[PDB]
Structure formats: C-alpha cells, structure tokens
From Swiss-Prot, chains A, C:
Listed result of changing residue 203 to E: Changes channel selectivity from I(-)>Cl(-) to Cl(-)>I(-)
Taxonomic source organism: Homo sapiens
One Pfam family named in its UniProt record: Voltage_CLC
Domain comment in the entry: Isoform 2 contains a C-terminal PDZ-binding motif mediating the interaction with GOPC.
ATP-binding in keyword set: yes
Cystine pairings recorded for this chain: none
Organism phylogeny: Eukaryota, Metazoa, Chordata, Craniata, Vertebrata
Protein name: H(+)/Cl(-) exchange transporter 3
Domain of life: Eukaryota
Entries under PANTHER family matching the protein: CHLORIDE CHANNEL PROTEIN, H(+)_CL(-) EXCHANGE TRANSPORTER 3
GO terms for biological process, alphabetical: adult locomotory behavior; chloride transmembrane transport; endosomal lumen acidification; negative regulation of cell volume; phagocytosis, engulfment; photoreceptor cell maintenance; positive regulation of reactive oxygen species biosynthetic process; regulation of pH
Curated annotation (Swiss-Prot), chain D:
Domain of life: Eukaryota
UniProt entry keywords in alphabetical sequence: Endosome, Glycoprotein, Lysosome, Membrane, Phosphoprotein, Protein transport, Signal, Transmembrane, Transmembrane helix, Transport
Chain ranges on the Extracellular side, renumbered to this chain: 1-67
TM region(s), chain numbering: 68-88
Role description: Transmembrane protein that binds to and facilitates the assembly of lysosomal proton-transporting V-type ATPase (v-ATPase), resulting in enhanced lysosomal acidification and trafficking. By bringing the v-ATPase accessory protein ATP6AP2 and the v-ATPase subunit ATP6V0D1 together, allows v-ATPase complex formation and activation. TMEM9-controlled vesicular acidification induces hyperactivation of Wnt/beta-catenin signaling, involved in development, tissue homeostasis and tissue regeneration, through lysosomal degradation of adenomatous polyposis coli/APC.
Family: Belongs to the TMEM9 family.
List of glycosylated residues: 16, 25
Organism for this UniProt entry: Homo sapiens
Protein name: Proton-transporting V-type ATPase complex assembly regulator TMEM9
PTM statement from Swiss-Prot or TrEMBL: N-glycosylated.
Cellular compartment(s): Lysosome membrane; Late endosome membrane; Endosome, Multivesicular body membrane
Gene: TMEM9
Portion of the parent chain present: 23 to 114 of 183
C-alpha cells in the first residue's frame, strides 16, 4: 500500500479492528515467506520472540531505573538534613552504618555525618543550630523543587504528574505522541528523584509506571511488529505498566492485577503471562541493584482477631471519607488552576507549595521524615528493641497524648498538602501520600484500641480475645489496614490494591482485614461518587476516554447521536466513480472529518466503503509523486479493477461497521467498547443516513453528565 | 549485614552526571542557543 | 411480555447482548419503582446487594463442602490400611494423634490403630499378614470405586469428571440443565470422597471448582437478578469457580487468576472483586473447619541459586513433554471409549481400573500412599529430624539407588494410570495426579543434582554456588518445580498456575523458578499442540465452544458461511403482516431454526427483525390461552400498533446484528467472540441474503481442524 | 479435652543416643523439652545441647469437627444408598 497509510494523527483514537486486521495481514505475509529462505525463517523466529524480547527489555530497564531512582532519592532526601563529610556521596543511614559511636537512643548518630549547623554554625545543638538546620532544609527543598519544575518545563512538559490517567487514556486507544518518548523518560526519571528530595507531598512509586511505559514504547520501536501496530504497542505498554507497578511495590502479582484492572482497556490472555514475566524480571533486577525481599516487611506476632475487624472497617470508612473528599477537593483545585491565573505560573506554584510544605514539616518529626520512611516506621510493630517515639508511651505504662497529637498534626498536614501537591508541574504520585495518610490514621486507631484493651480488659470481648496484660493489639496492622483503606478510597482499586499491599508487607495472614477495609473504603467513596482520582483527572483533562460505567438513556437511539442530525449539513460523501482528485482534496481540506464515507452513487446513497481522511490525502499525494499527470483533473475510481484515474480502493475499508437508526444507543456503546470502533455508520433502508463517531458518543455522555 | 559500595557508586555518580549535563544543556538553550 | 419468553432450551448458547438488555430493563423497572413505596426501596436494596449475598453464600457453601470432603476423604483413604477400634472415626494420624507408644522410626504407629491383618489374622507382621493387607486394600478400593460409579450412574450422570471443561463451555454461554443442580452437587460431593479413597489416579481439587459452581448456581435462584438473567448467573458461576479453586488450593488470589484465565469467557471488573471476596470467604470457612495456614508448606533454608535454573528448565521441558503426551494419549483413550464397546460398560471399566491401580500400587510404598500425601512428602526438605525414606541415603552417606528406583517406578505407574483414570464415569481431577508426577520427577532430578554436587564439588559452578560439604541443593524445591512444570504442560495455565503453586507452598522466593519452569513446559506443550487437556476434552465432547485462538482463513467471507448457501432452500422468513398463526406454527414445527428473520414483505426481502422460534411458539400458545378465537386463522402482525390479530412484535428483536457478505469472516468471528452474538444476518444491498450462526462458525472451524 | 490437645518434642540423634519423640498433654507454656523430656538420655552438661537440637511443638485438634463431619457424611451416604435400593427393588 501507499506509505503512511493506516497511521494516525496526534491526539486521535485508534481503530482496534483495523490494527488487528493489519497485524493478521503482516502475520500472513511473514509466515508465507518462511519457506522461501532460511533467512526468512530466522526473521519469523525473531518476530515470534519479539514479545518475549520486548517485555524482557522493558522489565530490565524498569528495574534498573527504579533502583537508580530509589537510591538517588534516598541520598538527595538525606542531603537536606546534612552531609557526610567523610563521604559526600552517602546518606545518613549509610554514613552512620559502620560508625562505632552509634547509640541506642540514636541509631543514625555518628560523627562522620554532619548537620548543616555543624558545617556552618559549628555547634550540633542550640537555637542557632536548629534555626540553621531549618533554613537549610527549606532552601534544599526549594532548590530541588525548582530544578524539577524547570527541567519538566524546559525539556519534557509531559514528565509532570503520575501519568496513570494519561496511560489509561493511551491504553484505550488514545494517542499522545511524545508522552512515552525518550525525552519524557529521562526528564521524568531525573525530576522524580528531585521532587521526592524536595519533600513535597508526593510519591515516586506510581510515576514509575509511566517510566516503565516509556521504556516499553522505546523498546517497542526496536521490533517491527510493535512499531507498526498500535494495538500490539498498547499490549506491550500494559506489560510495561505491570512491570512498573512491580518495581514500585515489589508486587509482580499486584502489578499484573493493576495492569488488568486499572490501566489496560483490553487484556488478551497472552498479555497476562507476558506482563507477569516482565514484572518478575523487573523485580529481580531491582532486588539485584536496590538492596545494599519485602520493602515494608511487617512482623505482627499476635494473629488478628475477629473483633479487630470492627476498627479495620472503621478505618475503611475513613479511607472512603478522605478519598472522596480528596477527589472532590484536589480536582476542584486543579480545575481552579485551569480557570484562574495561578496556573499560569507553574514554577512559582511549585516553589510556594514546597516552601509551605518544608516550613510546616520541619517542626514535626513525622512530617519531616520522608513519607516512605514514615510509612515504614508506622508499619513496624512496637518492641523492647525499638526506640521509636510512637512506642514511648507503651514503655512508660503497660506520653500517649503527645504522640497521638503529633500523629494527628502530621495527618492533617499531609491531607491538606496532598490536595495542593497533586497536579502541579512535577512528577507526583498519590500512592505514597495516600499510604502515609492511611497509615497515620491506622496507627492512631490502633493505639486507641490497645489503650482500650489495656485500661479496660474487664470488657468481655477484650478479656476473651486478649489475655489480661497482653499486647494483643498490634498498631502496625492497623496502620497497614488504614493505608490500604485510604488508597482504595482514593483510587477505588479493590483486588490489585489488596494484593499489592500484601506483597509490599509480605503478610498473607492479613489479607482478609485488608480486603474488608478496602471494600468498605470503596463503597463509602462510591456513595459520594464512583469515579476515582485517575478517572476524575481524565475527565478534568477532557481526554477521549470511554468507560463501561457510563451508559445512555433507554430513550436514546442511534438516530439521536447521528452526525448529520438536522441543523448540520448532510455528511460529506464520495462518489465511487466520476470524482476528480481535486474534488477529494477540496473535501479533505474543507472538513475536519476523520474519514469520509464513499457511496456508489449520490442519488443511490448506497455505502461502498469508508476512507480515512489521513489515508485519502496520503494516497493522493503519494500517487501524484509516483505517477505523472495527476494534476487533480484525473478522476478517482474506488470500484474494484488516457485519464489514468487514481485507485483509492486499497485505502478503503470494504466492510465498515454499520448500524441502524432504530438501534438503541446502549447496543452502539457496547459495540464501541467491546470492538474499539473509531466510528460506525447509521444506515436506513440499505442507504447511508448518518455516521456516529466515538467522539460523538463521548460528547453525548459528557453532556448528560454535565447536566 | 552486607552492602554493595559499587552499586551506590555507579547509581549516584551517573545520576549526578546526567543531572549536571541536563542543567548545562538548559543553560545553553537559555543563553547560548539564542 | 408473555411468560416464558426469553428462556433458553437445553444444550443451547445464550445471546449475551439480549441478556444485557434484559438486565438493563429490569434495573430500570426496579429503580423506577423505588420511589413508589418503602417496600420497593427495600426490594431495590436487596437487589443491589444480591451479588454480594450470592457470592457470600457460594463461598460459605464451598468452604464447608471442601472441609467435609477433605476430612471424609482422609478417613476413608485410611480405612483401606486399617481401622481404629478405639475410634471408628479417626484416620491413622488421628488414631496415633496422642498415643504414647509411637516411635521416632514410625510416627503413625500406635496400639489403638489396627491393620486388617491384626483384625482378622491377629498378627501385625508375617507373610500372611501382608497378603491379608494386600487383599483388604484391593477389596476396599474396589468397593469405594463401585460405590462411586454406581452413585454417579444412578442419580447424577453429570457428576463424573472434573467438570472444568463443561464449566468452561457453560461460562462461554452454553447451557447444560442439571449440570449445576442440587442432585449433581450432592452426588459429586459423595463420589469425590469415594473415588479419592478408592486410590485411583485422580484428585478432588479440580472437581471442587465444579462443586462450587453448583453451589453458586443453586444460590442464584434465591436472588431474582441472577436467576432471571443467564449472563448474571454466569458471572456468579465465575466467582464460584474462583472460590472452588481457592478451597482446592487455599489460593484466593490464585483462584481469581484461574477464574479469569481459564473458565470465565467474560470477566467484568466487578466480578474480579466479587470472586476475590468469595474466595476469601470460602478459604476462611475452610480454615475454620478443615484444620484440626498452608497445605503444602515447604521450608528450604538455602535460597535457590541461578545455576539451578538449568535443572528447573529441564524439568519444565519434561513437564511439556509429559503434558503433550497425556493430551495425545488420554484423548485417544477417551475417543476409543466413545467409539468401541468398552465405553458401554462404565461401572466395569471403573472396577477394572481401580483393581489394577490398587494391585500395582500396594507393593510400592510411594504409590500406596495417598497422592496428596506423596506430594507433601516429596516437597518436604530432608533434615536430621525427618525420618523419610527418601532421605535415608542422605543419612547413610553425606540406599540412594533403591529410593530413586522406587520413585521412577511410582512415576511410571502414575503416568500410565492417569491416562486411563481420567475420563471414567466418576469425579476425577487432573491437578493432583499432575502435581504428583511432576513432584516425583523433580525429586529424582534434585536427588541427582545433590549427588553431583556432593560427589563432585570440584566443579566450578558447584564450588562457587555451594560450599564444599554443604546441602545447598534442596530436592523439595525441585519437586515443586517439576509439579508446576507438569501442571503447566498439561493445563497450559501460566500465571494462575504459578500463583496457585506459590500460595499452596507459601513461599514467594521460588516464584521466578516456578514461572520459568511453567513457561518452558507451556512452550514445549504448544510445540506439540496449543490446546490444553480441558480444551481437548471440550473438542472431543463436541460442545459449541468458540475460542479466541481459533480463526478463519483470509479467503473466507461472510457469504461462505451464510446459511442458505446454494443447495439448502431459502431460509424461512415470516411476513410482517397477512400471515396466519397457523402458518407461524407450521413453520416452527417444520424447521429447527433457533430463530427466523422477520421481513416486511416477501418480495421486498427487507429485514424488519429477528423472532426466536421459542419466543414465537410461547407467545402464540400464551395468546391462544389468554384470548379466545385464536384458532390459527387470525393473522399475525409484527408491525408496531374482528380478526383480533396476534401481536408478536414484542418478542421480535428490533435490531438484529447485521454484516455484509463481503465482510471478512475473521471480523465476523471477532464480533461473535467479543459480543457473544448468537447469530448475525448477512444482508446485501440492504436486503436479507442469509444468516450466519455461532453453530455455523463452529461447524466450519471443526471441519477446518478435521481436514 | 485431653484427646484434643497435646505437645510433642522431637529429638534428633545425638552422640550415642538415637532420635526420640516425647509426646505428652500439657499447656502451651508447659510444652518444653525439659518438662516434655523426663528423664534425658544425654548427660546433664549435654542436656542443654540436646534440647537445642530438639524441636518442640504444641498442637490442638478439633476432634468434634471430624466427629460431626464423618457422622453426617456417613448418614448421607447411607441414605443415598438406601434410596438407590428403593429405586432398584421397591420402585418396580
Ligand atoms: C543515569 C540517570 C538516569 C537517566 C535515565 C536514562 C534513561 C533515558 C533514555 C535515554 C534517552 C536520551 C534522550 C534523547 C532525546 C531524544 O531521543 O529525543 C528525540 C529528539 O532528538 C534528540 O535526540 C535530541 C538530543 C539533544 C541533545 C542531547 C543531550 C544529552 C543530555 C544529557 C544526558 C543524556 C544521557 C542519557 C544516557 C542514558 C525525539 O524522540 P522522543 O524523545 O522519542 O519523542 C517522540 C516519541 O518518541 C514518539 O513516540 P510515541 O508515538 O510512541 O509517543 C515518536 O513517534 C516521535 O517521533 P518524530 O521524531 O518522528 O516526531 C518522537 O519525537
Ligand atoms: C453431609 C455430606 C455432604 C452432602 C452434600 C450436601 C449438599 C447437597 C445439597 C442438597 C440437595 C438434596 C437433593 C435433593 C434433590 C433435588 O432437589 O432435585 C430435584 C428433584 O426433586 C427432588 O427434590 C427429589 C427428592 C427425592 C428424595 C430425597 C431423598 C434424600 C437423600 C438422602 C440425603 C439428603 C441429605 C441432604 C442434606 C444437605 C430437581 O432439582 P435439580 O436437582 O436442581 O435439577 C435441575 C437443575 O436444578 C436445573 O438447574 P440449571 O438450569 O441452573 O442447570 C433446574 O432448572 C431444573 O428444574 P425443573 O425441575 O423445572 O426441571 C432442576 O430439575
Ligand atoms: C537494554 C536494557 C534493557 C538493558 C538493561 C540492563 C540492566 C538491567 C543491567 C545492566 C548492568 C546490570 C547489573 C550488573 C551487575 C550486577 C551485579 C550482580 O551481582 C547482580 C546483578 C547486577 C546488579 C546487574 C543487574 C542488571 C543490570 C543493571
Ligand atoms: C540538585 C542536586 C542534584 C545537587 C547536589 C549537589 C550537592 C551534593 C552539593 C552542592 C553543594 C555541595 C557542598 C558545597 C561545599 C562543601 C564544603 C566542602 O568543604 C565539603 C563539601 C561541601 C559540604 C559540599 C557537599 C556537596 C554539596 C551539598
Ligand atoms: C446457606 C449456607 C451458605 C450456610 C453455610 C454455613 C456454614 C459455612 C457454617 C454452618 C456451621 C458453621 C460452623 C459452626 C461452628 C464453628 C466453630 C468455630 O470455632 C469456628 C467456625 C465454625 C467451624 C463454623 C464455620 C461455618 C459453618 C460451617
Ligand atoms: C462405603 C463406606 C461409606 C462404608 C464405611 C463403613 C466402614 C467404616 C465399616 C464397614 C465394616 C465395619 C466393620 C465391621 C465389623 C467390625 C467388628 C467390630 O467388633 C468392630 C468394628 C468393625 C471392625 C467395623 C468397623 C467399621 C467398618 C469397617
Ligand atoms: Cl507514588
Ligand atoms: Cl499515582
Ligand atoms: Cl484434582
Ligand atoms: Cl482437574
């Protein structure tokens, strides 16, 4: 065919049926030539292994990038507190790892590491030392935020954000050229570390999915099958997202579940195993580099009890109530950024947000501590070896009020900051902030329950379930349940989230509580709205996304959504014969229609086919270059084989999808969702009356929702 | 307990080098490119 | 509408689009009636929770039945070895549960337990005692097999077999009335225990899926939403299959993965969380009853090494090489059963197979032991505390040849016996036999590797990976890898299998080796055929099952598959008006068509819709009963509103799916698979030219495969 | 119930003495090698090493659950067989 036929414009949804037909044709062509020569057999073998090779490459790259990002972020975050003079290249834990001056009270207390007060003021302790450390922490946070936002703006504007919403749109057939490019990959990889170092209320776990998707696209350019076909590319991208989640949480099964449930519109059976393999490879690479087998490993000696479900369910409710609130709050704020002029200054917004975050975080130890580190500390169970402040009260009696007050302040600060930090023009992830919020809430609830059990063991439930004077209540389990509940409420992920949490903490004994809390949070959030944060952001950005949840009224019929309607002029059509190249070019230029239907005769209105406008113009130009005398006067014949008329039947679709006007629009939407139709043709009495397009369907659904 | 010094070596050094190269390219674009 | 309209005959596929429209209409009615009264609101609330209630009931029933079946099977299997006079309800382990006469050499040795020889001969040791034990073992196996097959034949013929193939076909849309009924549930529950106790080369894990599906089908009747609609019932059945796998292997995540991968043709996102919840509930129940948290828990202190992948890959290959063989062997045997007279005597076949199995198994220790117990013994890691025979050689030097020879004999016995055992008229499972075969092979391979390492530590690989004189090699890991490889080769499941194995073992450190082995086994099996054992059985049974793998030739067109063709007379059509009730009834009786296309006029041949034969006859009979004077003379008008003509427009489908003759048959098959269409009306120039049916597509594909 | 609860200490072979299992009924805290093992075949100074090599566990079984499950399964099987006999002989 003509070069460039079958391609797509930027910001245009693909036709899955056409891509599948192209893939089948390519498979037939490559298979036919296998017997021709041995080199053809080798090429066919390479093509057959293209999926395995591409998923392996994507997994390896994702694992390496995740490890690099994790270590770089840890080092940069510890940069704020101070510098290890003996080794400018190490973080606090690494600098004090081998120090023999370490004390039980302070594990990370070593002479080699020097805080900025020691560097400049010269005294580790004192009001001047505290002020100097405060100022340097704020300055470093602002510097990291400025670098991240400037790098995003200058090189890869797409690098900002989690990327899960745009990935969801892309995997549904949408095209955003440059989103998964090399520039975006590099800029996002650097800016993720920079942003996590800045201390902003964001995470790097979610954006690693976008990083993996970028790697998958870049590797797919290597293999002809995936470069040529968009649907196969999107399958590779689904595998890449699975690998990204795997590296993010060390949960290959959780990553596969997330890919299946959240980001993958169409999930073939083979893609399941391919994604699992990619996730396993990426997790192996991360385990090979990053350690120096479970990130949030938890050791709760006492098994969870049935009554303990009631607090967990309560946490679930909170997980919903916050979640929906965030979905109602953040979106609004984001919308304001689009409507008002405070969004006109992304760098300034990032800088002010970072300043506020650092200023309010330094006073409170939990806020100052890295969000992932805070989640880890919350998950850890109290023990005699532990010297954590959270457990101090337990040592005192067995100040609880002071610890709970600090935890509540950190919870409020994180809740307020996550609203204004998500959506800014730097790579930000909601997974870690939601996990920290839920973990703080669960820690508070578990402390309260343990206090109730200890003070009031006379209660029959506590006495029967727990022995008197026994620490049956384990706050770490409550923190895990709260984190899972908050994440489920904000994202509405049910199975993938539970499996991800289980893999992240390596606890199969707490699956039931996690599922109960996640279900409670999901139901509570759905009570205030079923759309999740990612889908809400998709709708906010106005991407062409269609979801199974959306549905039409029973009264709506295919005639209602037809493009021609009444006011609009009749849809442009092409005659099968007696049409000049000039006429087709004029029709292409005049209208922005994605494609034009071609009928045998204008009076007959009998559909012959459907030719995409891009394909029409590409074919016309290529034929003009190839064959002389095509000055626009020569006619174009779409029928099967001096003027030397141009033949555009090849670009034509011989069997375009057709529906009837009296067909209800529910069936039309079902067909569009299942088969991924770009457009369908509404015909009455065997003649073309109108055309329904995916864009018209989304327009009607958006109009119904907006009413 | 055991740790790998060379992993941190490579990761930190290459990340810093890439960041510095990006900043230098940004400066070139802002001033030199005009 | 007329009562009985929309119902489906036995051995017929359901139209998923029509079921979706029915569900939407019912939802509209229920939601509309909510404001009418508070009782209507309560009914709507019950409808909304109907899915959660039905999945909860299915999970509870599945857990209870699985626990009861497991305990009864254990007791009845140990009945063959002997009886516990002090307690006729304890198996060998329970009867020696607390005895103080036990010895380190013999764990299950107590005076309380008494072998049949000591019951009847009075001597525990001696040639006569051994002969008596042999005879009683054979007699008990024969009695159990006879009882199982007699119950299957007398009451529930469907109880035979695993049921996974039929579950697949049903979830695809196929209907088998009585397969998931109460009679089948009870008979299968009893017969699974009977067959497992008989000692035949079969398992109860796979059949638990069918048991859970039966429970779900029975519970669906309680809730009108799932009882009225077939697609909703099939979603509930998918959740039930997930719960069944969960109870079978204690793998709720693995159960959901299996449900998506293998049995469920369509898996809506909601069904994912519903299935996970059902599986968790069933597993919780099983833990509540059956224990008295991992069934096949293994403890390999030494982590798996990279070089060990090479043996594992080898095991993988073996898996596939076995799997393919079984698929080519068993099916052939099964085919012979359908072709020759030995299938006319099911009970005799079961008796003979059970006798052969017992006779050849009693002499060898591994074969005599229960298959699940043998798998557990193979999986366990050898240690000084353990007194297993398999590890005796390790104790002696560190006889190996004797243990290896016995293991190979057991492997051969199981491999040859599984071919004949599968397909007989009793509940049989392939999971446990495949696990045992693969575990024996992996144990042999691991013993060989350990012997190579110990004898030859000078090898650079062994010396570098393993310390000299150290038991780095863990044969239990090799046995697990072999079991996974064999199961992947026979079933061809990739991710669900790996997750199920990991859950059944409880170790996430061996997921990479297991995945590699499963990948190798699946690739090797596909080299000899891409169809799994369950799919092969589906094809052998001739069920109307359409798979995504199956595809038509490029040359094939919708015209080729059109029903009228040339030799066949024109397909029957119903005139919109001026056609008598007698004429419709005569057409219904004359032809066995699933439905007739209704055209406006015979000459026009303009399609007005599609009227199902069942709906047509039901409506005609109901109208005759309701309204007097309908003796068949009155005309029938399908058009929208003395003779009092019958109105059959309601039953008729206003917008039947239509395709063009020139459309490639690949597109038609894709549409059928994605939308679950029962039939599509091929029309040319806006007039009816023929009909393609899922039966026609299946027939064409079957002929293509048979060529 | 005593039958429902027990605790066992498994001792692998140590010097002259071979492996030995000591199974008695005791509470969880009373489940220990010194209490479970009485006397110890090994000498006093090596008794501690013998205990270290010894692995002890405390187990509980719901014998009543097995009771009920077996009883109900047997009752159902008997009823089904009686109905089969009814159909084969009496029904004619
Ligand atoms: C250690 C620390 C960790 C860092 C992380 C490392 C992994 C990252 C991968 C490396 C990529 C590198 C980024 C090259 C830019 C690129 O390569 O940028 C293409 C434009 O020229 C150019 O090189 C411009 C180069 C100007 C100077 C480079 C200075 C160097 C900077 C200093 C550090 C470099 C070290 C990296 C080593 C690793 C445009 O290519 P793109 O960036 O791919 O963007 C579009 C997209 O790919 C669409 O794909 P889609 O449809 O799938 O969305 C296509 O279709 C479009 O094609 P078109 O050109 O025909 O429009 C295409 O432009
Ligand atoms: C402890 C040990 C563990 C054991 C396991 C316990 C759980 C098992 C569930 C209990 C079910 C019980 C089985 C009742 C037969 C049934 O109830 O059988 C229906 C036919 O009359 C009858 O009662 C016949 C009753 C003759 C006397 C009963 C003697 C008693 C025997 C001695 C032991 C009983 C103890 C159980 C306690 C628990 C016909 O019902 P079915 O068995 O369901 O078969 C068809 C299918 O359900 C289709 O469903 P589908 O389209 O979804 O595939 C429908 O559509 C058809 O309906 P139709 O009648 O209009 O044709 C329908 O016949
Ligand atoms: C084209 C792309 C996919 C290639 C990516 C290759 C990456 C994944 C490779 C390049 C260098 C590799 C590392 C090189 C050395 C070591 C040390 C060894 O003790 C463990 C593996 C480990 C840590 C490797 C992990 C994988 C690694 C990071
Ligand atoms: C944006 C990111 C990537 C930049 C990171 C650069 C960091 C590591 C640099 C910038 C300024 C540097 C400091 C500048 C001056 C000194 C004084 C010297 O006697 C010891 C090193 C020390 C204390 C440096 C430590 C490393 C340092 C903190
Ligand atoms: C209509 C169907 C779904 C109802 C099925 C209910 C089943 C699951 C119920 C009935 C009796 C129940 C058991 C009754 C008593 C006990 C003892 C307790 O220490 C643990 C739970 C356990 C073991 C219950 C498990 C669940 C159980 C088996
Ligand atoms: C098909 C299945 C359900 C039937 C199970 C019934 C079994 C358990 C029955 C059948 C025959 C029975 C035995 C028949 C005779 C005796 C002798 C008596 O002094 C002690 C009990 C003893 C030894 C019985 C034990 C239980 C027994 C083995
Ligand atoms: Cl994140
Ligand atoms: Cl995110
Ligand atoms: Cl089985
Ligand atoms: Cl099976």
């Amino acid at each position: 065919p003509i070069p460039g036929v079958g391609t797509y414009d930027d910001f245009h949804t693909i036709d899955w049926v056409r891509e599948k037909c192209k893939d089948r044709e390519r498979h037939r062509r490559i298979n036919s030539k296998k017997k021709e020569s041995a080199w053809e057999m080798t090429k066919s073998l390479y093509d057959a292994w293209s999926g395995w090779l591409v998923v392996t490459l994507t997994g390896l790259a994702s694992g390496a990038l995740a490890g690099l990002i994790d270590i770089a972020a840890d080092w940069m975050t510890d940069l704020k507190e101070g510098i290890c003079l003996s080794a400018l290249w190490y973080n606090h834990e690494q600098c004090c790892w081998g120090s023999n001056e370490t004390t039980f009270e302070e594990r990370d207390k070593c002479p080699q590491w020097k805080t900025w007060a020691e560097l400049i003021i010269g005294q580790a302790e004192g009001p001047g030392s505290y002020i100097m450390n405060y100022i340097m922490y704020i300055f470093w946070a602002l510097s990291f935020a400025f670098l991240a936002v400037s790098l995003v703006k200058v090189f890869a504007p797409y690098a900002c954000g989690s990327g899960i919403p745009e990935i969801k749109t892309i995997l549904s057939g949408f095209i955003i050229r440059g989103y998964l490019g090399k520039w975006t990959l590099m800029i996002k990889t650097i800016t993720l570390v920079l942003a996590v170092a800045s201390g902003l209320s964001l995470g790097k776990e979610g954006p690693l999915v976008h990083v993996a998707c970028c790697c998958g696209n870049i590797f797919s350019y290597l293999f002809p099958k995936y470069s040529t076909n968009e649907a196969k590319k999107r399958e590779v991208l689904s595998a890449a997202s699975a690998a990204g989640v795997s590296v993010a949480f060390g949960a290959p099964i959780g990553g596969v579940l997330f890919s299946l449930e959240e980001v993958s519109y169409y999930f073939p059976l083979k893609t399941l195993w391919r994604s699992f393999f990619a996730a396993l490879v990426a997790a192996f690479v991360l385990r090979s580099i990053n350690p120096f087998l479970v990130l949030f490993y938890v050791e709760y000696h006492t098994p969870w009890y049935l009554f303990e479900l009631f607090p967990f369910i309560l946490l679930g409710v909170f997980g919903g109530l916050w979640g929906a609130f965030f979905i109602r709050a953040n979106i609004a704020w984001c919308r304001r950024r689009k409507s008002t002029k405070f969004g006109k200054y992304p760098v300034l917004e990032v800088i002010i947000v970072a300043a506020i975050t650092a200023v309010i975080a330094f006073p409170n130890p939990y806020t100052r501590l890295n969000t992932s580190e805070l989640i880890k500390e919350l998950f850890t169970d109290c023990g005699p070896l532990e010297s954590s402040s959270l457990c101090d009260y337990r040592n005192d009696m067995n100040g609880v009020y002071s610890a709970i007050w600090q935890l509540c302040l950190a919870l409020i600060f994180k809740i307020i900051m996550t609203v204004f930090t998500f959506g800014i023009k730097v790579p930000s992830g909601l997974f870690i902030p939601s996990m920290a919020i839920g973990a703080i809430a669960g820690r508070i609830v578990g402390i309260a329950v343990e206090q109730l059990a200890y003070y009031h063991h006379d209660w029959f439930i506590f006495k029967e379930w727990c022995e008197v004077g026994a620490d049956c209540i384990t706050p770490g389990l409550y923190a895990m349940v709260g984190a899972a509940a908050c994440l489920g409420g904000v994202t509405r992920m049910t199975v993938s989230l539970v499996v991800i949490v289980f893999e992240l903490t390596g606890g199969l004994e707490y699956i039931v509580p996690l599922m109960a809390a996640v279900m409670t949070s999901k139901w509570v959030g759905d009570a205030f709205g079923r759309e999740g944060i990612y889908e809400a952001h998709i709708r906010l950005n106005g991407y062409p996304f269609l979801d199974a949840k959306e549905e039409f009224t029973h009264t709506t019929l295919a005639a209602d959504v037809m493009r021609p309607r009444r006011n609009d002029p009749p849809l442009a059509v092409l005659t099968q014969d007696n049409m000049t190249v000039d006429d087709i070019e004029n029709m292409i230029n005049e209208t922005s229609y994605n494609g034009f239907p071609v009928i045998m005769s204008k009076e007959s209105q009998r559909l012959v086919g459907f030719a995409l406008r891009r394909d029409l113009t590409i074919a016309i130009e290529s034929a003009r270059k190839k064959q002389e005398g095509i000055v626009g006067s020569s006619r174009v014949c779409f029928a099967q084989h001096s003027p030397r008329p141009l033949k555009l039947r090849s670009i034509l679709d011989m069997s375009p999808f057709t529906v009837t006007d009296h067909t209800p629009m529910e069936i039309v939407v079902d067909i569009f969702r299942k088969l991924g139709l770009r457009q369908c043709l509404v015909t009455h009495n065997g003649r073309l009356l109108g055309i329904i397009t995916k864009k018209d369907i989304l327009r009607h659904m958006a109009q119904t929702a907006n009413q | 307990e055991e740790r790998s010094t060379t992993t941190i070596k490579v990761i930190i050094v290459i990340y810093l080098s890439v960041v510095g190269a990006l900043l230098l390219y940004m400066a070139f674009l802002m001033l030199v490119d005009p």
